[PDB]
Amino acid sequence: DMYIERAGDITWEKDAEVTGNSPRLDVALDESGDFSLV
Amino acid sequence: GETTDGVYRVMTRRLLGSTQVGVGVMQEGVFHTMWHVTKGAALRSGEGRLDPYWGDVKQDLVSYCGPWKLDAAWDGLSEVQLLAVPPGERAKNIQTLPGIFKTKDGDIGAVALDYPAGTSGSPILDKCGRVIGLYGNGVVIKNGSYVSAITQGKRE
Ligand SMILES: O=C(Nc1ccc2c(c1)CNC2)c1cc(Br)cc2[nH]c(=O)[nH]c12
CATH class of the missing domain: 2.40.10.120 (Thrombin, subunit H)
Structure with missing residues (x-):
């Protein structure tokens, strides 16, 4: 049996750590909800 | 409870x-x-x-307990915040500018942050704090890193 535990509030945080890039990828989605690259 | x-x-x-x-x-x-x-x-x-x-x-x-309630959408231009909740670690907001998943049925937002699979389901937010989607379903790129889609459901 799976159970849930509170982890916090859902709020926007000013001065948060800004990281990560913005890539444009050609993807395909199959019937099993799985993505792949084209 | x-x-x-x-x-x-x-x-x-x-x-x-x-x-x-x-x-x-x-x-x-x-x-x-x-x-x-x-x-x-x-x-x-x-x-x-x-x-x-x-x-x-x-x-x-x-x-x-009820139908999907989250219906905020990424505006296609602004930075978002992945509120990551990693296994054994405290919840933490990460600000990023999403990329794009180009598909046969249109485009989807994509956050390029790599976290353990147990972080699947973490909310992605707009400047208003609203949930624009969930993190955890995407693809593995040439580097090995994960790029997840901004997955949003439909509010009836
Ligand atoms: O595997 C992951 N997600 C997933 C798993 C199973 C299924 C789907 C998505 C949709 N169809 C069934 C995953 C999620 C995160 Br967050 C980080 C990852 N790093 C990886 O290498 N895989 C993942």
Whole structure:
């Protein structure tokens, strides 16, 4: 049996750590909800 | 039991110790998570029980106690915040500018942050704090890193 535990509030945080890039990828989605690259 | 709004960890005791299998959002008495986190199984919230109400394997989403309530969309131009809740680690907001998943049926937002699979279901937010989607379903790029889609459901 799976159970849930509170982890916090859902709020926007000013001065948060800004990281990560913005890539444009050609993807395909199959019937099993799985993505792949084209 | 507990139905206060907020982000929650999805745990299991079926393996060794307590293992975090995913994350979800509680909003308007409905728990929202990714399908692959629970497989549609019932969840426990203290003494209470949450039963699945809606789910779809292709969208990779599932709601508990009621229909999907999250309907905010990425505006296609602004930075977002992945509120990551990693296994054994404290919840933390990461600001990023999403990329794009180009598909045969249109484009989807994509956050390029790599976290352990147990972080699946973590909410992605707009400047207003609204949940624009969940993190945890995407693809593995040439580098090895994960790029997840901004997955949003439909509010009836
Ligand atoms: O595997 C992951 N997600 C997932 C799993 C199973 C299924 C789906 C998505 C949709 N169909 C069923 C995953 C999630 C995160 Br967050 C980080 C990852 N790093 C990886 O290498 N894989 C993942």
